[PDB]
Amino acid sequence: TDIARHVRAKRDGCGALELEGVEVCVQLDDKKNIHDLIPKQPLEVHETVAECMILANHWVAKKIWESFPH
RNA sequence: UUUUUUUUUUUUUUUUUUUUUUUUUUCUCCUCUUUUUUUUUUUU
């Protein structure tokens, strides 16, 4: 939690653009038919893991660029 | 006291052959309406 919170702190002091999409989820029972629909949401922990893997993939891309130029 | 005679089941067998699924019609034909076309993002 703390690590993610403050990786967020930094890379928003830089300043990202965090926006959203109109996404909905669907549950299907035994009969395979629509019990109900439910709008889904972005959760704190989604943001945490999103930024952890952003920074990860970022260092990855750095490594592989300085490692292979063209 | 009533003798004698009037044929019967066609003859024949020791002939060659080098093709081939099917088969033969039916004309030109008015697709109705918020749009440029949305798009990163993350959790599978």
Curated annotation (Swiss-Prot):
Native organism taxonomy: Eukaryota, Metazoa, Chordata, Craniata, Vertebrata
Intracellular or extracellular location(s): Cytoplasm
Physiological role: Catalytic component of the RNA exosome complex which has 3'->5' exoribonuclease activity and participates in a multitude of cellular RNA processing and degradation events. In the cytoplasm, the RNA exosome complex is involved in general mRNA turnover and specifically degrades inherently unstable mRNAs containing AU-rich elements (AREs) within their 3' untranslated regions, and in RNA surveillance pathways, preventing translation of aberrant mRNAs. It seems to be involved in degradation of histone mRNA.
Protein family (similarity comment): Belongs to the RNR ribonuclease family.
Gene: DIS3L
Subunit structure: Component of the RNA exosome complex. The catalytically inactive RNA exosome core (Exo-9) complex is believed to associate with catalytic subunits EXOSC10, and DIS3 or DIS3L in cytoplasmic- and nuclear-specific RNA exosome complex forms.
The name this protein goes by in its record: DIS3-like exonuclease 1
Residues of the full protein shown: 633 to 702 of 1054
